[PDB]
């Protein structure tokens, strides 16, 4: 017998006798919606409690405030930490934070919910980890954006690059022309890039 | 091929930690005490898997008789009971400090066990995802001393699947079966960074 | 020949590991300022990239990017007559953590374009700063500058790394040392020009 | 064949003595702690091998866990904390007396473990060469004496592969991690023989 | 079972079962400077601290000086002893000093880094074990050399025979003529074929 025998090594899966060899257990039928990897359901995009700053959680806490009469300022802001903040309960924060390292593609979404009157211009900034996350409207526009018209396109999906932490800002370009409180709608998902690896578990 | 799910449900948690003493336990088989595997198995709704048990017999101050009782067969109720020797139950005999290992296939009655069960056969009691109970004795007789065996159960789910992912539990549990809850956002300004 | 031309600049004039810097714009020679070979100088440490962080659009580009990812060719000129005598001892030091004269500021770690003069982390040139003597340091890619022999030397020095790109900044990937083995003797002081220029630079 | 790096830094050496009570005692996995394994990894500035330990359990006057936690899993804290059972913390029992025996994979972050480390990431606290900790604790419950189980670890690195050869180191160590030295060249005249 | 089951001989690699069966690693690229066999950066030559009389190890160390108006002296003198004396800090005494046995042979070179205008007759005389090492230069001449003009040729490379210990001179054949003190540069390698066997661990 070579060194470690007999030993019980939990991560040795091995066959084993069954201990009802007999048993025929009822067949196995195919019930629908199968998930055979987990990057099958971070690909459907999930709303992200981005306004943390409401005591209790609550449907409201799902929803971003935007107000009218204000340009220059800032909507929301947010950084990346996959495992504490703002993304710890979120599907992404959820299942990321059972492992340790998260290499991937994100695939970030927001969603108007105005009035089909009101129409706004956000600038969607995006600063990549190590450089310093915008404090004005103008240095996010001078970088890295979409001009996404409420007005117009009430949806827009922005790709972030592959990442293996940066930052993401929102500033009124114009200001929002109200009808004679409004809310924004952010999702997040995984883009199909996104690998995991080292499962790990939170206590 | 770490998210597979053959290896995110299937790693050996140990689902009970009890005692015996030199007397016995029942455990109806439950794999949601655990909230570490609970967590785990609830963003799913249901999930079959053939199980895998590694027994681990301490002593502290010898046999171990590990019985897997199926769904029906009477369980023990005196250490002495006559269903301790009935043929149907299987019992493996194994000493105090190594450890037993056998495996039990799929004793569900449906095509997989169900996690949640939105109606009556009692909301939560369903008699779908009874794997059966195990029983455990020491088999020795008027031992001069009393040596309590702590024994350690680590089941391994084999053969994973998973259906209809359901969204990941954020609270803590009350209550064994039965989603009953008792602020798990925590608050930043939400322009700040 | 002797008219070696990289981009808008233009100068008058051994590979490490045999392993040529390649890819997975900014390839100009720098000069720095010349150093004094006096009769009493102990050595010259030149951290790589970050001799480079203020150098221009080579040093801009280290500063804005993070990750990034260069190569170099070093030529270190020590211009003598053929009356001089002395020979410098030109060595690439992958990974050159220093003991320090408890962990070493950074202030000398990252010393920029003028360096570490060991004549003033230790700088105690007999242990190459680490407890391991100076003699055993001929492993690494060198080549001695003797003015009978010869006055310049070229190291050609790859990207030796084990992340593809790290951030510049934080973490010299190589460092060029030239240490005074022989000391000048003249019928007293001599200058040394060293010109660095950054081939094979990949940013993020 | 004896010169190459697969035979010259792969042998297995005891890279930790300890002595645990009947409590326990952590260690972060540093090969470097040996001066001779750290006299024959500083001629590589970075070395990538498989780890393999085999763990020796002595009594001196009983079952062993050995627990390899990852990198980012919690240490214990107590010896009755929940971090012991962690599913995701592999461990291995075994008898006071025998030896265990496993294998640990690559588990650095870069292409390669950081022997040195030229810049901050603390010049030489680096995550790269991090390989997680080992945890060790005698499973058993109010045993009414104390026995100390001297546990011998035995690491040898397969599968070795070695880049940028050094300096070799001629002055003795000072720190763990740090290149921080307090004439190793003796005098003979120069002339004699 | 058979004798000698259940034992741990620390020098029997064998085949044992993986903690972490799933995780895969970190792909290994490949990083320049590869070493696959200590033979390959013995060749390399490093210099020796050949200059043991001075009190403190320095750069002088490995400076052997050379003196004007010296005729029939010895420059330097050395033993082959690859364990001890001035070659146990060297590379090749530093990996020599890890094995029992050091069959091979060596690649003996010195670098004169005197001014232009200085020239001298130096004679690298080799004795082989079992003879006495010569104590004047013309014992040393009569025997095996090199007559190796320092003014014409500034390195010479001597490839010393197998060995398997042997002394080493050097005399002044004419004297130096100085312009209107001086160092010697020693360097020291190993020739491809030298082998190395049971490696020991020196405490």
């Given at each position: 017998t070579l060194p470690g025998s007999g030993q019980f090594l939990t991560t040795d899966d091995r066959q084993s006798p069954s201990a009802l060899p007999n048993y025929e257990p009822t067949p196995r039928i195919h019930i629908p919606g199968?998930?055979?990897?987990?990057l099958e359901i971070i690909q459907v995009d999930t709303l992200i409690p981005?306004?943390?700053?409401?005591?209790k959680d609550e449907v409201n806490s799902y929803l971003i405030p935007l107000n009218a009469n204000?340009?220059?300022?800032?909507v929301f802001g947010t950084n990346?930490?996959?495992?504490?903040?703002?993304?710890?309960?979120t599907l992404l924060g959820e299942i990321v934070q059972y492992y340790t390292h998260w290499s991937g593609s994100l695939r970030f979404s927001l969603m108007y919910t105005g009035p089909a009157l009101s129409s706004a211009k956000l600038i969607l900034a995006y600063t990549p980890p190590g450089a310093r996350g915008p404090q004005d409207r103008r240095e996010a526009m001078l970088g890295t954006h979409v001009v996404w018209d409420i007005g117009l396109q009430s949806t827009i999906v922005m790709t972030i690059p592959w990442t293996s932490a940066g930052f993401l800002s929102c500033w009124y370009q114009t200001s929002l022309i109200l009808p004679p409180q409004v809310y924004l709608l952010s999702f997040i998902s995984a883009c199909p890039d996104f690998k995991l690896r080292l499962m790990k578990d939170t206590q | 091929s770490e998210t597979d799910v053959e290896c995110f449900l299937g790693r050996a948690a140990c689902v009970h930690v009890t005692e015996i003493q030199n007397l016995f336990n029942d455990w109806?088989?439950?794999?949601?005490?655990?909230v570490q595997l609970r967590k785990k198995l609830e963003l799913f709704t249901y999930v079959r898997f053939d199980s895998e048990y590694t027994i681990l017999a301490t002593a502290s101050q010898l046999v171990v008789q590990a019985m897997y009782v199926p769904p029906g067969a009477p369980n023990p109720k005196?250490?002495?009971?006559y269903t301790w020797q009935s043929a149907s139950n299987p019992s493996v005999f194994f000493k105090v400090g190594d450890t037993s290992r056998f495996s039990v296939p799929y004793?569900?009655?449906?095509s997989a066990y169900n996690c949640?069960?939105?109606?009556?056969?009692?909301?939560?009691?369903?008699?779908?995802?009874?794997?059966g109970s195990m029983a455990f004795r020491?088999?020795?007789?008027?031992?001069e001393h009393k040596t309590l065996v702590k024994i350690r159960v680590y089941h391994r789910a084999k053969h994973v699947e998973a259906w209809i992912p359901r969204a990941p539990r954020a609270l803590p549990y009350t209550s064994i079966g039965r989603t009953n809850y008792p602020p798990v956002i925590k608050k930043r300004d939400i322009k700040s960074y | 020949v002797q008219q070696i031309t990289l981009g808008n600049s233009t100068i008058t004039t051994v590979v490490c590991y045999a392993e040529w810097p390649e890819y997975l714009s900014v390839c100009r020679f720098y000069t720095l300022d010349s150093k004094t070979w006096t009769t009493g100088s102990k050595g010259w440490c030149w951290k790589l990239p970050d001799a480079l962080k203020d150098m221009g659009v080579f040093g801009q580009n280290m500063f804005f990017h993070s990750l990034g990812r260069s190569g170099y060719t070093v030529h270190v000129q020590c211009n003598a007559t053929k009356f001089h005598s002395g020979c410098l001892l030109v060595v690439v030091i992958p990974e050159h953590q220093l003991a320090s004269h408890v962990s070493v500021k950074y202030t000398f770690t990252h010393?920029?374009?003028?360096?570490?003069?060991?004549?003033?982390?230790?700088?105690?040139v007999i242990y190459n700063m680490?407890?391991?003597?100076?003699?055993?340091?001929?492993?690494?890619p060198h080549q001695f500058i003797n003015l009978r022999t010869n006055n310049t030397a070229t190291i050609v020095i790859p990207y030796?790394?084990?992340?593809?790109?790290?951030?510049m900044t934080r973490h010299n990937n190589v460092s060029l040392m030239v240490i005074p083995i022989a000391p000048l003797t003249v019928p007293p002081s001599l200058p040394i020009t060293v010109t660095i220029a950054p081939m094979c630079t990949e940013f993020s």
């Open positions: 199968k998930v055979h990897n987990l981005m306004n943390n700053t409401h005591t204000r340009q220059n300022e800032q990346l930490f996959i495992g504490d903040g703002v993304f710890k309960t | 109806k088989i439950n794999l949601s005490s655990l005196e250490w002495d009971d004793v569900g009655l449906a949640f069960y939105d109606g009556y056969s009692q909301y939560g009691i369903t008699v779908l995802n009874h794997m020491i088999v020795n007789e008027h031992d | 010393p920029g374009e003028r360096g570490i003069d060991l004549s003033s982390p230790v700088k105690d680490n407890g391991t003597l100076l003699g055993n340091l001929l492993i690494f030796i790394n084990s992340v593809p790109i790290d951030s």
